[PDB]
Amino acid sequence: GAYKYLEELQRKKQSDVLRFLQRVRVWEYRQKNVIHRAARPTRPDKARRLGYKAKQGFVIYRVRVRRGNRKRPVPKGATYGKPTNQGVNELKYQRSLRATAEERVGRRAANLRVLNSYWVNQDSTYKYFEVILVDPQHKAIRRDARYNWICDPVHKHREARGLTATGKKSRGINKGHKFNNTKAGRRKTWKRQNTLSLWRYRK
Amino acid sequence: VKELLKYSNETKKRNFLETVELQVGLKNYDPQRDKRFSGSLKLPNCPRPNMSICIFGDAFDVDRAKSCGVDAMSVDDLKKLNKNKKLIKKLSKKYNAFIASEVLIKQVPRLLGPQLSKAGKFPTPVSHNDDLYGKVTDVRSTIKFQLKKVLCLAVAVGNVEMEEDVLVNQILMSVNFFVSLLKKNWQNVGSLVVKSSMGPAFRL
Amino acid sequence: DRNTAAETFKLFNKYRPETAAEKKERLTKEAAAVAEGKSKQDASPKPYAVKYGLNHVVALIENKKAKLVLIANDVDPIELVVFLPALCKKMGVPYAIVKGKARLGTLVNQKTSAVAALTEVRAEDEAALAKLVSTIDANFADKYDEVKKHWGGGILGNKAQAKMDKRAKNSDSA
RNA sequence: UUGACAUUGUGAAGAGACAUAGAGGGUGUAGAAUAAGUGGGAGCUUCGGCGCCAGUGAAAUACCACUACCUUUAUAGUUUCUUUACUUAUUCAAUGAAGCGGAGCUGGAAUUCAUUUUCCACGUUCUAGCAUUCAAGGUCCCAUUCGGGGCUGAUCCGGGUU
RNA sequence: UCUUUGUAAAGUGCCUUCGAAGAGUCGAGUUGUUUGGGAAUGCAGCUCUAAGUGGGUGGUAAAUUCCAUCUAAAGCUAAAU
RNA sequence: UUGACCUCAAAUCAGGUAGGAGUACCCGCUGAACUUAAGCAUAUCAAUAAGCGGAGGAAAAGAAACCAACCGGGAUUGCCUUAGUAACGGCGAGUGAAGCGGCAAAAGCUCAAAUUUGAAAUCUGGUACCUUCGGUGCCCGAGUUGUAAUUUGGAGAGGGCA
């Protein structure tokens, strides 16, 4: 096929062709709404390898998230406590911007379920993503057992509980000795070792 | 590969129109420094002769001025001193020994210049005169490193067939590469502009 | 231009893929044939339809089997199609950039097609095929390095262009 | 508040050097002779001529070359400085995005050095009135019904609201 | 117990050509945070930005040379809890 | 002038679907301070409480970009243990894991990237019928900017042979 060729074009992002296309598209999205419908992917190579089958029910949205640091609330900087916890400007917000994009399109189109998302663009002020939401009640998705797992109601809002490719990243989940804050989730492995486990016949 | 071009071979034999002994010259290319202890300071045996004319001013002493009447070019002594300092220049390179190291301070102003004497680099004051004379009348190369980067030497003759001249350019590549200092760069064989004396230049 | 595209779409009006009714007809014919003569899909004649589909056409160009390739001047994900002139130049297959992917859709009975490819041709129009190949290679494939070195774009709007013309006329000449 | 990077691209000046070869430049003694150094080397061209040799100096040549040394960039881009010239990014502002840009017409300033080389205008000023019915007129149609359509009246071109 | 669904499907031996395998990602600098993780455990901002006998990891940084074990940047899955 | 394509829409269009409550457990974000240090600023309380978002009968994790260095082991979870150790820390107060060993349970896999190209063979919907949680036929649509079959790193694909 030709997705190998689109893949290798999409890897070289600062050559003159892709920086031209990136500037046309960054204007093209900076003149539309914040969350708006994408009739077709702009990266079919990247979209298809995340789970896009171009048939009915798979919808593509495109989304601008603002770009920077989470300036803390609790107004006028007066954080009312120890001077340890007194930062306002340099706090940096454990969720990715890729998670805020998916979560906002999941709050808009709520009958749908989110599969993944991919980068398309970034300027200085914004990041631009496309989200690859699936419509689960549509009968093409409910059949064909590769894609009915989104129908099971334990997968409502994969994007909110951290279940996509990036939610499973931002939660720190892998195997490894380097992942011991969380390998099986952080809070379960917190409570599993601040439990004082007792027994009937006290050892 | 050195087989598509000539580089020592039969391909450049009719390019030069002089029907005299015209010799091939190989230039090694690698950036070096300006100091004098760096580079490839070695002149090995060239296996096939360069086919050059050379006469030796053997100014020898008691134990060594007897093996020059069999296989040599000229027989000299240490008494003939008032010639090689003023007028005569009929020589190509000399050959001396270690037995007389006090006559070397006399023939400096005339013979050290055009490479007719020895300073420190070429095996000219070698003592053995019964076996090293089958190696110097079969004329060797000349490995002499210059100021910034060039290495001009002589391998063989272009009119010589490619049977004798097949292990001569190959043994010479293994001298300016392995005994060399660690002050050279990567790809010590980077460029080899090889032209003999008259024709075009054939490079690797 | 209009003339070479006119000849090309005459040639492609001669070569269209099989529609549903013709498929039903050949299904009835081979359903008779397999039940009676037991010809393993060999009582049907050999097709000569146009090749189309982007992975299809790219694989046919890679395997050196494409005679001619039409390319659209289109879809804004142009990463789909900017590597087709370089493939057709690298693999020697002639290539033409026809205007509008909708005519490519109408000759293939789709909405759009975005590529078109001849690999087979019947013996009626070998000469017309060679003439079209000659015309397109005069237009595209021989002119590859020239257009490869030049930068398009930079055309101004006509207001600022006319202002630049007035200024460059009145600052250099009289 | 200031500096650096990103959004942030593109033309026009000024110094560093490369793709790419060439004309030429580079004068302490001696030595036919301005040898920045090296290699091959006793000969080449029909001849002449030079060259080997000779002699000289730290360096011997005719002949073909490499590194270099000072200009010349003719062809294409990379850099920091000049702020200049940019609209498409960006930012502001206004309007129920109404006349913007370019060209022509009639007048007229305008003097012609051949014929226009240019530039301005290009429907309203005593008056607390009025200004609307796709516009009257002119012109071409319908198939003459009572009516309706087209162009002009109100210049074309470009679709960038300014 | 009624169909025999099928000249269909699956499975394994030998030789040859092969053998595609996820990029603003991996990673690195710095900052905030967290960890038991200590020249930096993980996440996140911004800046730079890859590779293919490549890439991660082998918990004192770095250079050089081997070895070992793995395949990321896509997705499903009851029970023990 | 007719007829398509892309893109964006408008309906009390046809049919769907999400909001809320509970929230004991579970998944994430956000996030303190009293308190301990015999003061207090890092630290500790605590990666906690309050707030928020989202699920289920369990959630999550899950078939290794793992642990190891052995004679190697093999998805995940949980228990006994390693271990109050290694390490961190005004090296103060305190904070604090992992690998192996034993056991319960044990279950494995699926996509993208290969033209099927002698044949989109696939699918939503509407219709008519029925052995009407669905099946068949027909008909517009999605769809080749790619829907089916074939394979997924453990293998596998294309030819050839028995």
Curated annotation (Swiss-Prot), chain A:
Region (Disordered) location: 163-184
Keyword Cytoplasm: yes
Composition-biased stretches (Basic residues): 168-184
Alphabetical list of SMART domains matching this protein: Ribosomal_L15e
UniProt keyword Cytoplasm present: yes
Locations listed in the record: Cytoplasm
InterPro entries: Rbsml_eL15_core_dom_sf, Ribosomal_eL15, Ribosomal_eL15_CS, Ribosomal_uL23/eL15/eS24_sf
Organism superkingdom: Eukaryota
GO BP field: cytoplasmic translation
PROSITE patterns: RIBOSOMAL_L15E (PS01194)
GO molecular function, one term: structural constituent of ribosome
Protein keywords: Cytoplasm, Ribonucleoprotein, Ribosomal protein
Pfam families: Ribosomal_L15e
Record GO cellular component, one term: cytosol
Main location: cytoplasm
Listed NCBIfam families: PRK04243.1
Assembly description: Component of the large ribosomal subunit (LSU). Mature yeast ribosomes consist of a small (40S) and a large (60S) subunit. The 40S small subunit contains 1 molecule of ribosomal RNA (18S rRNA) and 33 different proteins (encoded by 57 genes). The large 60S subunit contains 3 rRNA molecules (25S, 5.8S and 5S rRNA) and 46 different proteins (encoded by 81 genes).
Other information: There are 2 genes for eL15 in yeast.
Family of the protein in this entry: Belongs to the eukaryotic ribosomal protein eL15 family.
Annotated protein name in UniProt: Large ribosomal subunit protein eL15A
Organism the protein comes from: Saccharomyces cerevisiae (strain ATCC 204508 / S288c) (Baker's yeast)
Name of encoding gene: RPL15A
From Swiss-Prot, chain B:
Keywords: Acetylation, Cytoplasm, Methylation, Phosphoprotein, Ribonucleoprotein, Ribosomal protein
Molecular function terms from GO: RNA binding; structural constituent of ribosome
GO cellular component: a single term: cytosol
Coiled-coil stretches: none
Pfam families: Ribosomal_L1
Phosphoserine found at: 67, 74
Main subcellular location: cytoplasm
GO biological process: cytoplasmic translation; ribosomal large subunit export from nucleus
Modified sites of kind N6-methyllysine: 35
Entry keyword Phosphoprotein: yes
PTM description: N-terminally acetylated by acetyltransferase NatA.
Localization terms from the record: Cytoplasm
Keyword Ribosomal protein: yes
CDD domains recorded: Ribosomal_L1
Role according to the record: Component of the ribosome, a large ribonucleoprotein complex responsible for the synthesis of proteins in the cell. The small ribosomal subunit (SSU) binds messenger RNAs (mRNAs) and translates the encoded message by selecting cognate aminoacyl-transfer RNA (tRNA) molecules. The large subunit (LSU) contains the ribosomal catalytic site termed the peptidyl transferase center (PTC), which catalyzes the formation of peptide bonds, thereby polymerizing the amino acids delivered by tRNAs into a polypeptide chain.
More about this protein: Present with 116000 molecules/cell in log phase SD medium.
The family this protein is said to belong to: Belongs to the universal ribosomal protein uL1 family.
Assembly: Component of the large ribosomal subunit (LSU). Mature yeast ribosomes consist of a small (40S) and a large (60S) subunit. The 40S small subunit contains 1 molecule of ribosomal RNA (18S rRNA) and 33 different proteins (encoded by 57 genes). The large 60S subunit contains 3 rRNA molecules (25S, 5.8S and 5S rRNA) and 46 different proteins (encoded by 81 genes). uL1 forms part of the L1 stalk.
Name the record gives this protein: Large ribosomal subunit protein uL1A
Species for this entry: Saccharomyces cerevisiae (strain ATCC 204508 / S288c)
Curated annotation (Swiss-Prot), chain C:
Assembly and oligomerization: Component of the large ribosomal subunit (LSU). Mature yeast ribosomes consist of a small (40S) and a large (60S) subunit. The 40S small subunit contains 1 molecule of ribosomal RNA (18S rRNA) and 33 different proteins (encoded by 57 genes). The large 60S subunit contains 3 rRNA molecules (25S, 5.8S and 5S rRNA) and 46 different proteins (encoded by 81 genes).
Annotated protein name in UniProt: Large ribosomal subunit protein eL8A
Keyword terms: Cytoplasm, Ribonucleoprotein, Ribosomal protein
The species this protein was found in: Saccharomyces cerevisiae (strain ATCC 204508 / S288c)
Any one Gene Ontology BP term: cytoplasmic translation
The keyword Transcription is assigned to this record: no
Main localization of the protein described in the UniProt heading: cytoplasm
Subcellular location: Cytoplasm
Any one Gene Ontology molecular-function term assigned to this protein's record: structural constituent of ribosome
GO cellular component terms attached to this protein's record: cytosol; cytosolic large ribosomal subunit
Annotated function: Component of the ribosome, a large ribonucleoprotein complex responsible for the synthesis of proteins in the cell. The small ribosomal subunit (SSU) binds messenger RNAs (mRNAs) and translates the encoded message by selecting cognate aminoacyl-transfer RNA (tRNA) molecules. The large subunit (LSU) contains the ribosomal catalytic site termed the peptidyl transferase center (PTC), which catalyzes the formation of peptide bonds, thereby polymerizing the amino acids delivered by tRNAs into a polypeptide chain.
Other noteworthy facts: Present with 238000 molecules/cell in log phase SD medium.
Family statement drawn from the similarity comment of this UniProt entry: Belongs to the eukaryotic ribosomal protein eL8 family.
